[PDB]
């Protein structure tokens, strides 16, 4: 019988992993901007610890 699951090698799974990696990298980029500007007024206003 054909074994069915959402697979990593499946193209839809490939796209889903690419989107997750893109989200992870966008979040990391936002964190990097928030850290290279950790003393700017905007970053202070939006609670930088939280």
């Amino acid at each position: 019988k054909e074994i069915e699951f959402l697979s990593w090698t499946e193209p839809f799974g490939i796209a889903l992993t690419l989107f997750a990696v893109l989200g992870i990298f966008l979040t990391a980029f936002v964190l990097g901007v928030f850290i290279k500007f950790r003393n700017t007024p905007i970053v202070k206003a939006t609670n930088r610890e939280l």
Binding site: K44, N47, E49
Partner: protein
Amino acid sequence: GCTLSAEDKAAVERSKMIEKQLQKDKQVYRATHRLLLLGADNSGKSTIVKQMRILHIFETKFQVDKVNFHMFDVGGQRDERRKWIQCFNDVTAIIFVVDSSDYNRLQEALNDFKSIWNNRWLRTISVILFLNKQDLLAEKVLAGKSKIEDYFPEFARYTTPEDATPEPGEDPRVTRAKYFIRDEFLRISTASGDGRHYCYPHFTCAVDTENARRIFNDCKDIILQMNLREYNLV
């Protein structure tokens, strides 16, 4: 209670009443804002404290809406011997009343403001700068009797700053002199500061009943800023 201390329980009840009164007074004391009213005698601060008496031992209890204010009103002047700046230090604001009409004493007012703004005892506390008796300054500038150039040298090359709030119909020369006198104090206020305290400037006259609301707004803004940098948000 124990050991049949008959009079001691009455003493405890007395202390309970006294502590209740003190706790009740604590609410008013904590809620009441504290103001240090500095300035020379010629500044006209007598008129403004009279106005506070009208609209809510040199004290001043005035209640703007639901918030109380206490002015200690020590002179803090060049000559006055009220060296109680170290005492009554943790105050909400400093009210620095200045007689902008008198040019000769205006430089001494500059010196007093410099001393107050640079005093490390009052570094945290901001200044509610009431440039008072402003109408007589308007009359003086309207005529050619006295000029700013007489005492302050750099009255020339001074254009009225952008967005320096016009008053409909007010003489442009008077407005230029007005904002020169104000920015002259803001020049001192800028130096020797990490942004901890701001010299809230206001143009006032001895026939102004809104000074209480100006003090209310500046005190609310001061509390807001101090909370904001205390929680690390500004």
